[PDB]
Write a protein that binds this ligand. Sequence first.
Ligand code: NI
Lengths: 226, 227, 113, 98
Amino acid sequence: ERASLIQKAKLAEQAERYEDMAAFMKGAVEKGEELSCEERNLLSVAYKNVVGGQRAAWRVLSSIEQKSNEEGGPEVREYREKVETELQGVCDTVLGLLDSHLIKEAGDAESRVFYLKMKGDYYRYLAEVATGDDKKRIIDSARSAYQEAMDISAAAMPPTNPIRLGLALNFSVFHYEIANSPEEAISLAKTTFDEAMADLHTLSEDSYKDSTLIMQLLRDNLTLWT
Amino acid sequence: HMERASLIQKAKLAEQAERYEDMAAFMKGAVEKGEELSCEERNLLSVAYKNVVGGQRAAWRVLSSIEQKSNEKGPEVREYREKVETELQGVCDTVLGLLDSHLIKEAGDAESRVFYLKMKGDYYRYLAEVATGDDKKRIIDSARSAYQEAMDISAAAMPPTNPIRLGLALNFSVFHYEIANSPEEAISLAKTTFDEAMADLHTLSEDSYKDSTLIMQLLRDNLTLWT
Amino acid sequence: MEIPVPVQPSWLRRASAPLPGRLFDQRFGEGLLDPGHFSVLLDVKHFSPEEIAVKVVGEHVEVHARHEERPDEHGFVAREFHRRYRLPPGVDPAAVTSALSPEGVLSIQAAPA
Amino acid sequence: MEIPVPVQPSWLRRASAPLPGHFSVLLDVKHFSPEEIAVKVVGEHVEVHARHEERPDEHGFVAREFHRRYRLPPGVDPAAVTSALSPEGVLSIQAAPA
Ligand code: NI
């Protein structure tokens, strides 16, 4: 059953049907076996494409809503609330899978950092659209997931590792955009980037391409934030 | 009336946000209020469903190609291709249901009548792309009839440079070539449509001119490809 | 007489974790895989916005890109280039703007004057 | 005359209605003449220093400069390092196994 669901998720990826891919991957995770590096990536690709589409849509509507509070309707608010609801459901699904199946005390630091970063990410996506005391709870949950992942990655992974680089990038986005700590965001992005150039020669063609891409992102964000 | 206005605004918002499934759902609801659609509203309905079905059609070809290649087989490709195919069929049946129960009328303007009949031919053509047996034959006949009724109206009521007329002749020629396996009829229809167009371009306004000059290039590209 | 042209990154938002020619300098391309105006496109792929300097020096628009020694695929590499373009007569030097795309394309433009 | 064959170009697709050890490196040094390129072996590295003064081009004036550095593997004799520039503008720096 699990092997079939993974094959179907690979087919859904080829067909670019990410909602289907996510559903197959959810089912595969629910079989109870640990995910391989390839399978983790299938799960991540599936849900990031679903949530990414929803997040991109919400910003368009939220921007129209913010602009239409000049020159003069309610349909924007009602519809923004609907999508927002769809986005919240996808984040809650991912977070549910992470907490009930994927987040474990064992084994590899790579897989542990991967899932904890994913937890921080989906809480951060919830924080992008959250409002009151709920927003505060969500911000705290993202911060905790990211910090636990940072502690593991600094102790177990080299500074050029793409999972470590990607995590530090997202946590710095969190500090700047969500937690409104631009200084912490700039400091984290600078440190991550600096610790990276010094270690690039230790990387293989595969790892090198991952780090060199992500360092460009850190640098672009620093250009934008400073 | 208030509900209809809201659904059209929401469809315009869904278009901006590029949420075409939502746009289609809002447009379906707006059509179900019972008022005839304006030129802008017809276009919203068409944009919504063509984007939904276009995404499904593009997906099916990828899967169908993998399935055809993996036979020089794994059950997963067949099962999944059957699923999508099913989603595509449902969208086409929804459009065709809306066209037959609300939009296709014997009144009024030839423009709106040709528009809806072309749309009927198009969605039957999309069903024919994935259909198989005696069902395929019935679907091919239904697309042919919708296109022919639209051609008859457009030849009698619209100038040869009209973009709805040009777009219709283009799709019917695609139908002849790809679906009905009549390349000669496809080439003949495309040539005739194109030829009748250059002679009449001067009679067009800046708005109509841009529509025709684009579509004639498409007819010409298809002729380059088919001949 | 010379005025500095600011290099603004075209892209706004911010980048998060992504889904995981040759070693030459520049020119122009049709796409990625005259009146009183100015419009040029430059490939500055090896330089960050802070490593590119655009100026209007008299009758010319100057582009000065430089990056200090950095590691790469084969070893270490430092690069530097200086490009110069003529500014047409009916173009106001104050109207000259510069932007850098996330793809690494530098566009220097000046609205008709 | 009998049956024509379609001249189907790669340019198009069926248009439908529109939407209403050793050492060996290869370098591209196309902008530099042989006299504008300097190759050296400095310790554990092979250095390439290319520089051309201001010259006219397709859009305006341009001066270029680059410095590339490559590590020299341990079992490679620095005296065995040779360099050649092809008429296509490719610089190849090689060192036979030692
Ligand atoms: Ni040369």
